[PDB]
Amino acid sequence: FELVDNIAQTAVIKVIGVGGGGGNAVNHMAKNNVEGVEFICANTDAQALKNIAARTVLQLGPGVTKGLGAGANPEVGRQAALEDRERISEVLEGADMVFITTGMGGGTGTGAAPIIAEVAKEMGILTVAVVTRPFPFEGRKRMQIADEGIRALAESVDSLITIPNEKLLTILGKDASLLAAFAKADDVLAGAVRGISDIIKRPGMINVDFADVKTVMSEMGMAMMGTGCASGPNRAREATEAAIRNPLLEDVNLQGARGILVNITAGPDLSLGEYSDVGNIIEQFASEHATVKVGTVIDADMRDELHVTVVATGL
Ligand SMILES: Nc1nc2c(ncn2[C@@H]2O[C@H](COP(=O)(O)OP(=O)(O)O)[C@@H](O)[C@H]2O)c(=O)[nH]1
């Protein structure tokens, strides 16, 4: 309750997007409602890094690729990354937590991300990776590489949030279309990152800190998440139902999650009343052993709506 942690709200959070898709997702975040974090784009494609939101960029494998980017080849991404080990670390120093975000299935992102996680993880930084999985319409070829990297990535991250791009279609449905599909991806990834950092950076009346997060998140590996967003007299219960009922949490057995982290983002009116509801609903779907951390986020530039965001760790 009363006693807060060592480096609570103060935690220096960096967010790095690897490869193309990643850069896109990141640059989206910048030009959006994602504050308290330092953005960074890291691509082997020197070209891509030209003129982008994030004020910190890192070109990988200058030698290996010559600013031409690992032609969808993971190995080239991994090689370019190892070449830049030093540079990677220089960019990471001072971070309490790092967000490696990227679209798996490509070359830069796929092969480079695991290395970067490896670095940070060594520096003793809370390493969380938020990555997508090719849309069905991307070919088994690409979908094959994704699993591949994800397997490797998992080996060196405190936690790994997978996002089955398929599900995004589920949602979209009618308006499903390349533009929207990837735009949606961008958005969801932003949610995942914003989802957690906001809990640390923009606390509400009841708050969770870095110590709380470190717990449910440190070396848990393999996570999934889902969002809900209601409003009106029962925005609480509703927004929560919607969260669990989120497709992105369709085939997930919360009873299994060793750790569950929750985020309630609402106006200055978010009463303790609701908070209780949010947690009660959760406490049922969770395994009595599971360690559940529920926190509040405060947002003014938002009204009656109350968005809940759950994250199942140590799956
Ligand atoms: N969210 C999001 N995902 C993307 C975008 N572009 C591509 N992707 C996905 O992420 C993967 C990475 O592809 P790409 O960025 O070309 O790989 P890179 O070689 O690491 O640059 C793809 O296979 C897609 O499924 C984008 O703009 N946004």
Swiss-Prot record:
Coiled coil ranges: none
Subcellular location: Cytoplasm
Keyword match Kinase: no
GO terms under biological process: cell division; division septum assembly; FtsZ-dependent cytokinesis; protein polymerization
Alphabetically ordered keywords of this record: Cell cycle, Cell division, Cytoplasm, GTP-binding, Nucleotide-binding, Septation
GO terms under cellular component: cell division site; cytoplasm
Keyword Cell division: yes
Gene Ontology MF terms: GTP binding; GTPase activity
Binding site for GTP: G20, G21, G22, G23, N24, G107, T108, G109, E138, R142, D186
Domain of life (superkingdom): Bacteria
Main location (coarse class): cytoplasm
Signal peptide as annotated in the record: none
Subunit and partners: Homodimer. Polymerizes to form a dynamic ring structure in a strictly GTP-dependent manner. Interacts directly with several other division proteins. Interacts with the SulA inhibitor.
Protein purpose: Essential cell division protein that forms a contractile ring structure (Z ring) at the future cell division site. The regulation of the ring assembly controls the timing and the location of cell division. One of the functions of the FtsZ ring is to recruit other cell division proteins to the septum to produce a new cell wall between the dividing cells. Binds GTP and shows GTPase activity.
Similarity remark: Belongs to the FtsZ family.
Other remarks in the entry: Formation of the FtsZ ring is inhibited by SulA.
Protein name: Cell division protein FtsZ
Gene: ftsZ
Residues of the whole record sequence present: 2 to 316 of 394
